[PDB]
Amino acid sequence: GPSVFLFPPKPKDTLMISRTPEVTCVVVDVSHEDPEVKFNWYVDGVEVHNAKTKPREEQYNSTYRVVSVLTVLHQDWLNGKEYKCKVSNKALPAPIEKTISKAKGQPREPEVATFPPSRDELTKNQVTLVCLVTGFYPSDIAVEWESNGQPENNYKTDPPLLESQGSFALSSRLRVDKSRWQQGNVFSCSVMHEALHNHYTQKSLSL
Amino acid sequence: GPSVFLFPPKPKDTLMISRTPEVTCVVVDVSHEDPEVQFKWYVDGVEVHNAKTKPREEQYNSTFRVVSVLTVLHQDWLNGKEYKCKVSNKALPAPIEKTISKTKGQPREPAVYTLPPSREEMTKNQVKLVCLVTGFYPSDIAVEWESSGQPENNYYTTPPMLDSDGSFSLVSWLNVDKSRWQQGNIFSCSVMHEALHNRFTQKSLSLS
Ligand SMILES: *[C@@H]1O[C@H](CO[C@H]2O[C@@H](C)[C@@H](O)[C@@H](O)[C@@H]2O)[C@@H](O[C@@H]2O[C@H](CO)[C@@H](O[C@@H]3O[C@H](CO[C@H]4O[C@H](CO)[C@@H](O)[C@H](O)[C@@H]4O[C@@H]4O[C@H](CO)[C@@H](O[C@@H]5O[C@H](CO)[C@H](O)[C@H](O)[C@H]5O)[C@H](O)[C@H]4NC(C)=O)[C@@H](O)[C@H](O[C@H]4O[C@H](CO)[C@@H](O)[C@H](O)[C@@H]4O[C@@H]4O[C@H](CO)[C@@H](O)[C@H](O)[C@H]4NC(C)=O)[C@@H]3O)[C@H](O)[C@H]2NC(C)=O)[C@H](O)[C@H]1NC(C)=O
Ligand SMILES: *[C@@H]1O[C@H](CO[C@H]2O[C@@H](C)[C@@H](O)[C@@H](O)[C@@H]2O)[C@@H](O[C@@H]2O[C@H](CO)[C@@H](O[C@@H]3O[C@H](CO[C@H]4O[C@H](CO)[C@@H](O)[C@H](O)[C@@H]4O[C@@H]4O[C@H](CO)[C@@H](O[C@@H]5O[C@H](CO)[C@H](O)[C@H](O)[C@H]5O)[C@H](O)[C@H]4NC(C)=O)[C@@H](O)[C@H](O[C@H]4O[C@H](CO)[C@@H](O)[C@H](O)[C@@H]4O[C@@H]4O[C@H](CO)[C@@H](O)[C@H](O)[C@H]4NC(C)=O)[C@@H]3O)[C@H](O)[C@H]2NC(C)=O)[C@H](O)[C@H]1NC(C)=O
């Protein structure tokens, strides 16, 4: 060290305009003898100076951790702009630059399908709803279950997986009480992806 | 080198009695100066002698590759016996030993549910059938699609995913031509897992 790791914003933050997408530049193994760290940020080479550099906190292996958060514009990230964090310290010989950007490739809209429970699974008290999300590119996506405008607890969403034609797919399944399903509660699968209109679609199901 | 790599049998081979599960011991970086490789095999530390060692095969980097195959008994593998491959070579200072066995943990039976397509997807030329396999342990499993006793291999299956209660889940979905679904062809999801009765279950669906 001192090593440098640069992290992208999360898909939902880049897709919803009210949220705050951040590029996070984490520096570790910053020593006691040479503690000074200078963060220089760039957007397609153009230097920018609005990064909140949080103060260097000590880790119990006796080296400081230093985080610099650059807030990005949603459209810049989505248009494939490159974000470069330049770190400089007296311990390291020459500056460590790292660059990230959105995954490249032509955007493809997800198709979203919901499946009600099996008649066989209705025997059990716990019951499964499935949201199938297919044909999307890039893999950056948010898929979430809700009911009555609130998040639904007991679900799992697998990672996006490549199909043969280059696009991605996943399933999300929600485990609900049989009684909630049988009394007609509406459950919705919300999908956020850059290739959807308004970056958002929702599909609902009920008995 | 030399370097040794030891590979387990595939779940479907361990689970179907007619099939032939094999543990495979591969040696690479075997030199021309010391080409003699001796395999010794052990099952829970007791030496066994039924391995079939293939003749050394020269590679394009001027080293030999030597493979030894031990056929295992299905029940031995499923009972958690340890298979050790011991490789002796003159270039090595001591023999290289590698050991493998089945993933540990209490077996849990998958529940299997099949879901027929969305009426919205019927607009497309292709259609999706979903097989939901949940609550299984260990993650070693084989999930396959078929119709009329023959494989339907245009599917994708998510890797086993860890649930909250310790067990694994996955989905597999089959991409079929719309016409085949509407004609009433029966499609089946076959699941092979050690915790199922007879190591196998099948769930089917068609248009009703
Ligand atoms: C002293 O202690 C230091 C701190 O560690 C604590 O750890 C405890 C367990 C314990 O040990 C304590 O004593 C100690 O206090 C320690 O620092 C560590 O140094 C390591 C380097 O040796 C770092 O390893 C790297 O980790 C990366 C992954 O980081 C994440 O996930 C882990 C957990 O899995 C987590 O610990 C980290 O904090 C980090 O979490 C992510 O954090 C970001 C930023 O905040 C989040 O993103 C933000 O999220 C917010 C909302 O919260 C918002 O959405 C913002 O938009 C967004 O910015 C993430 O959400 C969060 N992710 C989570 C939780 O999952 C790895 O990427 C990295 O791998 C790369 O480098 C390896 C070699 O170093 C290489 O082998 C590997 O292949 C990979 O290489 C890269 O590959 C990429 C492509 O795949 C390429 O693009 C790259 O170019 C390429 N890079 C290369 C080759 O360099 C690596 O494993 C470790 O992160 C760090 N720990 C922390 C906490 O920072 C220090 O080492 C210790 N010192 C000594 C001397 O011992
Ligand atoms: C000289 O040339 C040598 C030969 O190479 C040719 O390759 C050409 C492409 C080209 O380069 C030619 O010029 C060249 O001739 C070359 O040999 C190579 O050495 C490498 C090491 O330096 C080896 O790397 C390892 O590979 C492992 C994976 O191997 C499989 O997959 C690859 C493809 O991804 C494939 O090429 C291999 O053949 C091998 O295939 C598997 O084969 C087995 C046995 O047949 C099959 O199992 C059988 O299947 C049948 C049905 O057919 C039946 O079901 C039976 O039941 C069953 O026995 C598999 O189906 C098949 N798998 C496939 C195709 O995917 C890696 O796992 C291994 O990684 C591990 O070790 C690393 C460190 O050493 C570590 O970093 C890594 O994390 C990993 O760690 C392990 O983790 C495990 C837990 O997850 C632990 O249990 C382990 O303990 C742990 N090990 C550790 C930490 O060490 C590694 O990368 C390479 O395989 C080998 N190539 C061949 C062809 O043998 C040589 O290096 C060259 N020398 C020089 C000096 O250049």
Author numbering:
A (entry chain B): 237 to 443
B (entry chain A): 237 to 444
Verbatim from the authors:
We previously reported very efficient HD driven by the BEAT interface, which resulted from grafting the natural human T-cell receptor (TCR) constant domain α–constant domain β heterodimeric interface onto the IgG1 CH3 homodimer domain pair. Using a structure-guided approach and molecular modeling, we identified mutation D84.4Q in the BEAT CH3 (B) domain (according to IMGT numbering or D401Q according to Eu numbering), which restored near perfect HD in the Fab–scFv–Fc format, as previously seen with the original BEAT interface in the VL–dAb–Fc format. Here we report the structural and biophysical characterization of homo- and heterodimers encompassing the D84.4Q substitution versus nonmutated controls.
To investigate the molecular basis of HD improvement resulting from the D84.4Q mutation, the X-ray structure of the new BEAT Fc was solved. Chain (B) was engineered with an IgG1 hinge, CH2 and CH3 domain with the BEAT (B) substitutions including D84.4Q. We named this construct BEAT Q3A-D84.4Q Fc. BEAT Q3A-D84.4Q Fc was crystallized, and its 3D structure was solved at high resolution. Analysis of the BEAT substitutions in the engineered CH3 domains revealed identical side-chain orientations for the majority of amino acids (∼87%) compared with the original BEAT Fc. A direct link between the change in side-chain conformation of Arg90 and the D84.4Q or Q3A mutations could not be derived: the environment around the D84.4Q substitution showed no structural alterations, with side chains (BEAT substitutions and others) keeping the same conformation as in the structure lacking the mutation. We found that D84.4Q induced partial disorder in the Fc of homodimers carrying the mutation, as well as the excessive formation of half-antibodies—two phenomena not observed in D84.4Q-containing heterodimers that were stable and undistinguishable from nonmutated heterodimers as seen in the crystal structure reported herein.
